[PDB]
A paper describes a structure:
GULO, ALO, and GalDH are generally named aldonolactone oxidoreductases and form a group of sequence-related flavoenzymes belonging to the vanillyl-alcohol oxidase family. GalDH is a dehydrogenase that reacts poorly with oxygen.
The structural comparison shows that the only conspicuous change between the substrate-binding sites of the two enzymes is the replacement of Gly413 in GalDH to Asn363 in GULO (residue numbers refer to vGalDH and mGULO). We sought to unveil the role of this amino acid exchange by introducing the [name] mutation in wild-type and A113G GalDHs. Encouragingly, however, we found that the single [name] mutants had sustained activities. Both [name] sGalDH and vGalDH displayed a selective decrease in the KM for L-gulono-1,4-lactone and no drastic alterations in the KM for [name],4-lactone or the respective kcat values. The B-factors of the bound sugar were notably high. The substrate-binding environment is likewise mostly retained in the mutant structure. Collectively, these data demonstrate that the GalDH versus GULO distinction can be primarily explained by very few amino acid changes in an otherwise remarkably well-conserved catalytic cavity.
Residue numbers in the entry: 10 to 239, 242 to 244, 249 to 266, 284 to 506
């Protein structure tokens, strides 16, 4: 079994690959893996953009353990085997009239890999998915199967539920659900100025708010979602795509089939590191979005999904933007600086730069860790696309993205106290940078020392961790 992430930027062929169908079977696997000092890193769907779960030596998947065990019809709660995919849990929950509190744009993630990185959606009053776990069962190399909750070692619970697969193998999760609801989704464009005006009130008046920023333009695409009490409040598809189709014809039945995202991919392909060419692609996409204002209605699960496009490099940071009651302007200032920089340094940055918001997490490891609840994090995701399979063109884009991320890395993350998403962080080779990174992790995470202490307490032989984990927590 050879195993590759979504963007095929990372792949691994583990010497050992285990896929147990029962806790009993997994209990054994770790017991024996412990007894022998053999690596077994937990893996979910393997989709993490940075290969977090990848180990040459050994990996365990709970893909076959994916049943919904119990529904508490009253406390609005599902207990689910860790191997269940988000999609699988949305389907099972449907007839029980329940849904998850939030979704992370794709739904192929396993609950394990979903919670272990503190995945998030958007919505200023909605935490990342760590704060959605009531209880978990975790299989430890040292203590065996232990039950965690706000009651059973709540100190460990919060450190475990977001443990980057390093504190044990999660077998069960009880999740705080909300009632299955339809959602009204509003898409519109705006200027920086128009954003700044309605921003503070927009976050607070709208359940979900996401901004797609389009570099080398003053077009920001805003997407609000709110529950439909009772329903929905024009350009043709051909007319929406005309600018991108017209731009590609400059440099057909080949074209007429391509989706909006295939056109971007096919446009970027032409010359993805020439900044002037990207200027033109981004302007055309801005026009598309200008021709795509409107409303949709659907179930939260259908609406909070987002088509992310082709294979890609991405980097998302979570940084503090005050509290509900004391608004901050870090979030829009962050964006101003970043768009000042891309122009100043001639970065061939395609669209979109995705800015979202979450409530704080009580999970020490969450990149939106706050002691104060009703705190607010802005998340900002940068992207370069890999439109083709030319390893040549794919290594220039890899270069340029590292430089793009590196420039944010210095100029912004320190200033704003920005912590990287656990699924997107890349361990740099240059030993300067790795020590540079390490001092930043300490700087942004108080619970670090306590996290390696739980690693020795629960996995003293270190069979659950890979190079990545060792390099980040030395
Ligand atoms: C196209 C795309 C869009 C995305 N959008 C979002 C988004 O909107 N929001 C967001 O927050 N993230 C997003 N992500 C990132 C994604 O949520 C994470 O990569 C997620 O962790 C993937 O889940 P997985 O099951 O594939 O995890 P894997 O990559 O398989 O594993 C993730 C982590 O969990 C551990 N693990 C997995 N299963 C278990 C288990 N049973 N017990 C213990 N540890 C376990 C692994 O060791 C690893 O540390 C996106 C990724 C892609 C590719
Ligand atoms: O990993 C991710 O990929 C998407 C991004 O590519 C948006 O274009 C999600 O928003 C998330 O940040």
């Amino acid at each position: 079994h050879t195993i590759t992430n979504w963007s095929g930027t990372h792949a691994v062929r583990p010497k050992r690959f285990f896929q147990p169908e029962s806790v009993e079977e997994l209990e054994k696997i770790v017991k024996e893996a412990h007894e022998k000092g053999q690596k077994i890193r937990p893996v979910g769907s393997g989709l993490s953009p940075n290969g977090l779960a990848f180990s040459e030596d050994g990996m365990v998947s709970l893909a076959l353990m994916d049943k919904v065990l119990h529904v508490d019809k009253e406390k609005k709660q599902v207990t689910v085997q860790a191997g269940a995919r988000v999609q699988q849990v949305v389907d099972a929950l449907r007839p029980h009239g329940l849904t998850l509190q939030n979704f992370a744009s794709i739904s192929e993630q396993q609950i394990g890999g979903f919670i272990q990185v503190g995945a998030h959606g958007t919505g200023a009053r909605i935490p990342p998915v760590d704060e959605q776990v009531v209880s978990m069962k975790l299989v430890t190399p040292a203590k065996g199967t232990i039950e965690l909750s706000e009651e059973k070692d709540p100190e460990l619970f919060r450190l475990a539920r977001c443990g980057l697969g390093a504190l044990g193998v999660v077998t069960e999760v009880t999740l705080q659900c909300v009632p299955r609801h339809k959602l009204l989704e509003h898409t519109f464009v705006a200027t920086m100025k128009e954003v700044k005006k309605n921003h503070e009130k927009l976050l607070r008046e709208n359940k979900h708010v996401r901004y797609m920023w389009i570099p080398y333009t003053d077009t920001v695409v805003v997407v609000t979602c709110n529950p439909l009490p009772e329903k929905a409040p024009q350009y043709s598809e051909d007319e929406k795509l005309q600018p991108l189709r017209n731009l590609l014809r400059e440099a057909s039945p080949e074209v007429s089939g391509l989706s909006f995202t295939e056109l971007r991919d096919a446009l970027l392909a032409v010359d993805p590191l020439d900044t002037e060419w990207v200027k033109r692609v981004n302007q055309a996409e801005a026009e598309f979005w200008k021709r795509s204002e409107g409303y949709r209605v659907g179930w939260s699960d259908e609406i909070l999904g987002f088509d992310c496009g082709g294979q890609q490099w991405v980097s998302e940071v979570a940084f503090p933007a005050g509290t509900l009651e004391k608004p901050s302007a870090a979030d829009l200032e962050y964006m101003e600086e970043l768009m000042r920089l891309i122009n100043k340094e001639g970065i061939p940055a395609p669209a979109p730069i995705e800015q979202r918001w979450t409530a704080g997490s009580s999970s020490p490891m969450s990149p939106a860790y706050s002691p104060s609840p009703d705190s607010v994090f802005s998340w900002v995701n940068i992207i370069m696309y890999l439109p083709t399979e030319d390893e040549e063109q794919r290594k220039a884009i890899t270069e340029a993205f590292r430089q793009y991320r590196k420039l944010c890395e210095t100029r912004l993350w320190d200033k704003y106290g920005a912590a990287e998403h656990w699924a997107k962080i890349e361990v740099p080779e240059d030993p300067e940078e790795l020590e540079a990174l390490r001092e930043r992790l300490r700087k942004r995470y108080p619970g670090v020392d306590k996290f390696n202490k739980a690693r020795r307490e629960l996995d003293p032989k270190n069979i659950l961790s890979n190079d990545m984990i060792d390099s980040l927590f030395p």
